[PDB]
């Protein structure tokens, strides 16, 4: 009788909307009870039924996303909301490949004259 998130995750899309629809229907009836004379037990049901709306709607929104993630997993261009957000500045920095890029002149330099370990007797 209690709607729980993890049991809804494996459930198919079509009846999730069916599950969403009636819960909205009961929510409408509860609002009708509020404006009229309403039992306290009835007036307790809006909050729980409202949270199930969020619980169900979270599932579909959570369910809908990763198909788009795996759909765009290997593609060159991704939708803006699927790209990493981080910070605006941190998205402008050079990727890890470029900051490791080094010129021909330096490469000859470091191979010819590597930094050595040494000790001095005293």
């Amino acid at each position: 009788a209690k709607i729980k998130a993890r049991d809804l995750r494996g459930k198919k899309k079509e009846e999730l909307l069916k599950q969403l629809d009636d819960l909205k229907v009961e929510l409408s009836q509860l609002r009708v009870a509020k404006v009229t004379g309403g039992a306290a037990s009835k007036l307790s049901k809006i909050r729980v039924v409202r949270k199930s709306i969020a619980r169900v709607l979270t599932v579909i929104n959570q369910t809908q996303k990763e198909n788009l993630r795996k759909f765009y997993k290997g593609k060159k261009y991704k939708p803006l909301d699927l790209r990493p957000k981080k910070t605006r500045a941190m998205r402008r920095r050079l990727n890890k490949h470029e900051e490791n890029l080094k010129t021909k002149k330096q490469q000859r330099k470091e191979r010819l004259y590597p930094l050595r370990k040494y000790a001095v007797k005293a």
């Binding site: 909205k24 229907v25 929510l27 409408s28 009836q29 609002r31 009708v32 009870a33 509020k34 404006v35 009229t36 929104n61 809908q64 996303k65 788009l68 765009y72 593609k75 060159k76 261009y77 991704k78 939708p79 803006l80 909301d81 699927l82």
Partner: protein
């Protein structure tokens, strides 16, 4: 050239063909029929309208227009609407007077919601 003025020639303009959609998925319609109707109204003056005018009174979302209200009530309670009159209450809620078709009656219908 039969005219002394030089006009910018019209050039080809290509329709945009994005390499990727900027939005991953369409935004969900967050203002639906259940959002159209908030709750029916039960004040003393209201009751007069259901009896003498075959009209239902509703508190609706402030962003809904008369067309949106009419479609929502029809599919929510399986009735027909003749006309809808709306006003914005001083408290900021939108009140809609929805008049049913002559063949339907507001008495038996308003029993189905439980308001009447």
């Amino acid at each position: 050239r039969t005219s002394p003025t030089f006009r910018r020639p019209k050039t080809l303009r290509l329709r945009r063909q994005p390499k990727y959609p900027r939005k991953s998925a369409p935004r969900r319609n967050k203002l639906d029929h259940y959002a159209i109707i908030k709750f029916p109204l039960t004040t003393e003056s209201a009751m007069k309208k259901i009896e003498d005018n075959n009209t239902l009174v509703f508190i609706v979302d402030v962003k809904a227009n008369k067309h949106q209200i009419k479609q929502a009530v029809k599919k929510l309670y399986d009735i027909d609407v003749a006309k809808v009159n709306t006003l914005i209450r001083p408290d900021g809620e939108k009140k809609a007077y929805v008049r049913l078709a002559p063949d339907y009656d507001a008495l038996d219908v308003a029993n189905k919601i439980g308001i009447i």
